[PDB]
Amino acid sequence: MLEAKFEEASLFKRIIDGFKDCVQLVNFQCKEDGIIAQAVDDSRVLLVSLEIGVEAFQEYRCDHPVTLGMDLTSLSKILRCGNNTDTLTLIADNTPDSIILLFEDTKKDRIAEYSLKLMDIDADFLKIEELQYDSTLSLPSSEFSKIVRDLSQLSDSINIMITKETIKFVADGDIGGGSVIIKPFVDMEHPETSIKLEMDQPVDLTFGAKYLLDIIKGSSLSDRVGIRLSSEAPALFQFDLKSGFLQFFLAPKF
Amino acid sequence: MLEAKFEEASLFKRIIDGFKDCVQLVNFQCKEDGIIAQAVDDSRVLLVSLEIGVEAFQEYRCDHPVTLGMDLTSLSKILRCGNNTDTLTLIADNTPDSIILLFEDTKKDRIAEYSLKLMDIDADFLKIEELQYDSTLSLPSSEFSKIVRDLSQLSDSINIMITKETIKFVADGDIGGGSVIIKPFVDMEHPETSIKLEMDQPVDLTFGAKYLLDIIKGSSLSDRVGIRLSSEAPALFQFDLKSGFLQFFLAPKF
Amino acid sequence: MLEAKFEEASLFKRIIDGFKDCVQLVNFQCKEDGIIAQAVDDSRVLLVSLEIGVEAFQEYRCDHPVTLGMDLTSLSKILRCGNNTDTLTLIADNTPDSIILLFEDTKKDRIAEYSLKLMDIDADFLKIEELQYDSTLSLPSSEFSKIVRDLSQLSDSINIMITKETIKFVADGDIGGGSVIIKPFVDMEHPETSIKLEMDQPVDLTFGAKYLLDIIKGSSLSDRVGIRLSSEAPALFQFDLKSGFLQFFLAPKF
């Protein structure tokens, strides 16, 4: 029997928003020490990896490994049904035909129980993360969100260029162009505005805006975003959770 | 001469919102002791009955019965023109070709006078309400609104099932399912959250969500909704006014 | 070299909103004492004239006259990229191939530099304004905005009728009609609510709502709108700036 109790349904809903507009069906491998889930879009240039530790729940019990694949188009609908700041409990019994989502609230007033029909999905799990990445920066997700949103106005292709102590986002379109530059700094008034950068080797990569716009969906999950870049491999965009994370692996072109 | 003065135009606009997305043209039978109006959608499974007593206005005068049929698509447009919290006065003279809607405000600053061309419409008024209904409950319109909106995500058909001291709204779709259960209780901290239920005989009816979504439009008119159910006849959904009401008669299928 | 520094980008963005949904490409004739710009829609019934004095900027330098034509569809996109309450600096060098838009903020945190490819556009500048107009009124832009928006619901044609101390906006549609009447008055509690009217000769003109709706876009630029009317020539709708203005010349039909 599985019983994973989110303190606030928002968390799970906001997590699903990460996968939503970029992948369809996802296997949520549940087990002893939490949940993990992976998915890849049709064109195989964006991979989303989720890990949720036990501490991210208020209560978590999984007697025995249970893999629950489900349609996120359909799951999300049920997430709409819930009350944003209400306790959500996932329930399942061995070899589920279905998973039960369970909303509660303050008073035993309205307690909604939904059920989602599950689906068999062949896995073939990937493990592409690398040991070392040529460059590794971290900035407020809100700032990174802005930069992408703005430069997306001009070009369908955003170039990220990193020399030492210099991160340059560039967009060049038929219709004009644009470029933001930021620098590392420790902000003691509020360290959550800080910009970090550990450049081992410089990088000059170009990603599709279509996907960078999907990646910034996770901005609702963490104050900061973790962007690891190397020129031979996909970039790691990571939003950290209380215990766990949401990772986006994006391959740049050319 | 007719002169019906709403204190706030919102009331009349919110009333029209009740008829709007479910019926088209409506005869507003005006007379001595107020206004009444009835309408039925194309498929004849939803009937809307309105009664507005004199006390619901701040000033009301109707010398002589005047039946004013009008296009609610067109009327609503004029209701858009008005200032939400402004006094609205309906004016008409014997055998109107048209009705005049009259907005005012605080200062004699802007005073807008609109006119709506009326239409001849054959009536055939219905009187289908019954003496006794097998079950009769009442709950906060906001709560009932939620229940319908949520379960509408999953199924195009919502089943309401009432045994003693047990009201169970159920939705079962191709894509999972859902079900809310509520109980009667007197809430003294705020009696407007109370749930009442007088079950003479149990009921197990299923209505189309399409229409239950239209019915919850009246949630802007009253804190509570009055749902009377019987298994042989259409359900009565009623939102009470200061003096009057807005009723929705809905036939369940099968 | 040109360097025009708006204190807040909003101003320039809100100015562009004036031209936006009514004209396409516009030549911004920049020179010593500021910027001016003119444009005419396809059907040539709406002409927009802008003047921005030096005092409207916080810093302005134009060594030498520079005419910069540009696509407002495309310019606006870049105006989306900026931070509403941030300093915006237009930069250009002799015979630009392009103009540079430059956002800043509080801290030297994010400083975005965009560039817009310019376009050659043949001018043929118009000077149609007249010495005297038969009638000249001024009212709160918010009020005038409302009047147009409301009466636009009913008719695609709005008639403005001015006799002495009487301004009557009228709309008459297939579906009913409407008419607002206002009077001149000095409001000492707040003179910005005042309504002025200097009628030399009466006027009875009818304009297309399509365009009056475009004209009220400038309501974001000034508290009041200046409407000058004469029966032989286009109406002057003018929203005043700190130093300058945004004018809309509209020809009435029949």
CSV table of N, CA and C in Angstrom, one decimal, chain A residues 143 146-147 150-151 153-154 174-182 185 187 195, chain C residues 71 74-75 77-78 80-83 107 109-117:
chain,number,residue,atom,x,y,z
A,143,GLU,N,14.6,35.9,-12.1
A,143,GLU,CA,15.4,36.7,-13.0
A,143,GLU,C,15.6,35.9,-14.3
A,146,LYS,N,12.6,35.9,-16.4
A,146,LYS,CA,12.5,37.1,-17.2
A,146,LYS,C,13.3,37.1,-18.4
A,147,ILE,N,14.6,36.9,-18.2
A,147,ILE,CA,15.6,36.9,-19.3
A,147,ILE,C,15.1,36.1,-20.5
A,150,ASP,N,11.8,37.6,-22.1
A,150,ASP,CA,12.0,38.8,-22.9
A,150,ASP,C,12.7,38.5,-24.2
A,151,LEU,N,13.9,37.8,-24.1
A,151,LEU,CA,14.6,37.5,-25.4
A,151,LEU,C,13.9,36.6,-26.3
A,153,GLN,N,10.9,37.1,-27.2
A,153,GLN,CA,10.1,38.0,-28.0
A,153,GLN,C,10.8,38.2,-29.4
A,154,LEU,N,12.1,38.2,-29.4
A,154,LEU,CA,12.9,38.5,-30.6
A,154,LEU,C,13.4,37.4,-31.4
A,174,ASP,N,15.4,38.3,-36.9
A,174,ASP,CA,15.2,39.0,-38.1
A,174,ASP,C,14.8,40.4,-37.7
A,175,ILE,N,14.0,40.5,-36.7
A,175,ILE,CA,13.5,41.8,-36.2
A,175,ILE,C,14.3,42.2,-35.0
A,176,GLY,N,15.4,42.9,-35.2
A,176,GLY,CA,16.3,43.3,-34.1
A,176,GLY,C,16.9,42.2,-33.3
A,177,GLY,N,17.4,42.6,-32.2
A,177,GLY,CA,18.1,41.7,-31.3
A,177,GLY,C,18.1,42.1,-29.9
A,178,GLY,N,18.7,41.3,-29.0
A,178,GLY,CA,18.8,41.7,-27.6
A,178,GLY,C,19.8,40.9,-26.8
A,179,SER,N,20.3,41.4,-25.7
A,179,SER,CA,21.3,40.7,-24.9
A,179,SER,C,21.4,41.2,-23.5
A,180,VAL,N,21.2,40.3,-22.5
A,180,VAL,CA,21.4,40.7,-21.1
A,180,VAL,C,22.7,40.1,-20.6
A,181,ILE,N,23.4,40.9,-19.8
A,181,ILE,CA,24.7,40.5,-19.2
A,181,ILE,C,24.6,40.6,-17.7
A,182,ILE,N,25.0,39.6,-17.0
A,182,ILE,CA,25.0,39.6,-15.5
A,182,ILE,C,26.3,39.1,-15.0
A,185,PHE,N,28.0,37.8,-7.8
A,185,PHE,CA,28.1,38.7,-6.6
A,185,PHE,C,27.4,38.2,-5.4
A,187,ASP,N,25.2,39.0,-2.4
A,187,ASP,CA,24.3,40.0,-1.9
A,187,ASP,C,23.9,39.7,-0.4
A,195,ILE,N,24.3,35.7,-7.4
A,195,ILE,CA,24.6,35.1,-8.7
A,195,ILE,C,26.0,34.4,-8.5
C,71,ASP,N,9.1,49.6,-37.5
C,71,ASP,CA,7.9,48.8,-37.4
C,71,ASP,C,7.4,48.7,-36.0
C,74,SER,N,7.0,45.5,-34.4
C,74,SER,CA,8.2,44.9,-34.0
C,74,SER,C,8.8,45.7,-32.8
C,75,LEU,N,8.7,47.0,-32.8
C,75,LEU,CA,9.2,47.8,-31.7
C,75,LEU,C,8.5,47.4,-30.4
C,77,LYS,N,7.2,44.7,-29.4
C,77,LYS,CA,7.8,43.5,-28.9
C,77,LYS,C,9.0,43.8,-28.0
C,78,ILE,N,9.8,44.7,-28.4
C,78,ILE,CA,11.0,45.0,-27.5
C,78,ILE,C,10.5,45.8,-26.3
C,80,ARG,N,7.9,45.2,-24.8
C,80,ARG,CA,7.4,44.1,-23.9
C,80,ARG,C,8.7,43.8,-23.0
C,81,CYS,N,9.8,43.3,-23.7
C,81,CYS,CA,11.1,43.0,-22.9
C,81,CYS,C,11.5,43.9,-21.7
C,82,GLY,N,11.3,45.2,-21.8
C,82,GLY,CA,11.6,46.1,-20.7
C,82,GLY,C,10.9,45.9,-19.4
C,83,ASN,N,11.3,46.6,-18.3
C,83,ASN,CA,10.7,46.6,-16.9
C,83,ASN,C,9.9,47.8,-16.7
C,107,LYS,N,19.4,48.9,-9.1
C,107,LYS,CA,20.8,48.4,-9.0
C,107,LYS,C,21.3,48.1,-10.4
C,109,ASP,N,21.9,45.7,-11.8
C,109,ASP,CA,21.6,44.2,-11.7
C,109,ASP,C,21.5,43.7,-13.1
C,110,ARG,N,20.3,43.9,-13.6
C,110,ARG,CA,20.0,43.6,-15.0
C,110,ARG,C,19.9,44.8,-15.8
C,111,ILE,N,20.7,44.9,-16.9
C,111,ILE,CA,20.8,46.0,-17.8
C,111,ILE,C,20.7,45.4,-19.2
C,112,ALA,N,19.5,45.5,-19.8
C,112,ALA,CA,19.2,44.9,-21.1
C,112,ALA,C,19.4,45.9,-22.2
C,113,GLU,N,20.1,45.4,-23.2
C,113,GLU,CA,20.3,46.2,-24.4
C,113,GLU,C,19.8,45.5,-25.6
C,114,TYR,N,18.8,46.1,-26.2
C,114,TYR,CA,18.2,45.6,-27.4
C,114,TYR,C,18.5,46.5,-28.6
C,115,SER,N,18.3,46.0,-29.8
C,115,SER,CA,18.5,46.7,-31.0
C,115,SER,C,17.4,46.4,-32.0
C,116,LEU,N,16.9,47.4,-32.7
C,116,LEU,CA,15.9,47.3,-33.6
C,116,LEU,C,16.3,47.7,-35.0
C,117,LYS,N,16.2,46.8,-36.0
C,117,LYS,CA,16.6,47.1,-37.3
C,117,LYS,C,15.6,48.1,-37.9
